[PDB]
Design a protein around this ligand. Sequence first.
Ligand code: HEM
Length: 152
Amino acid sequence: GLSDGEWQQVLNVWGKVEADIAGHGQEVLIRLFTGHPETLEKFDKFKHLKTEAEMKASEDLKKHGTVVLTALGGILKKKGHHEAELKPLAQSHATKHKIPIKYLEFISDAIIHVLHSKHPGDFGADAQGAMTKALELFRNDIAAKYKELGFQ
Ligand code: HEM
């Protein structure tokens, strides 16, 4: 549950992402894969990437970063009223992709890391607080659907 002022911070931060969605999405995925190499094994289309240089050169990885961040941005712009947008993603990630909730924690922290890396000194403590809360709400509502489905 976020206040109006917290949502305002989230959507202000998101404007930074929307100025370069592909670059942010690329770096989020690279941070996930290099920090947590088990996550790479869930992507049949990326498992061939062995080095970070290959990851950086991959246009399909940048494409997937755009898909991921476009979906998250659509959810965030709903300010918590995201049941319709979130349900299909929870279902596909539990039943088809088999993504444990832990990996959604990993990508949440990776988003925070990338924002500080690309905008050092321009991602203030209030903005980090609000973004973190928004990602926790996203993860918590996915977790509820995972529990319904019995997925671990
Ligand atoms: C911010 C969180 C994330 C968002 C919004 C997101 C969004 C999406 C979307 C929109 C798709 C395509 C449609 C679909 O299959 O439902 C997708 C595909 C996928 N997601 Fe996620 N995702 C997230 C996190 C992750 C994480 C943490 C992993 C794994 C570590 C992952 C693994 C996958 C895989 C394996 C695919 C299929 C890729 C394919 O082969 O083309 N997702 N995701």
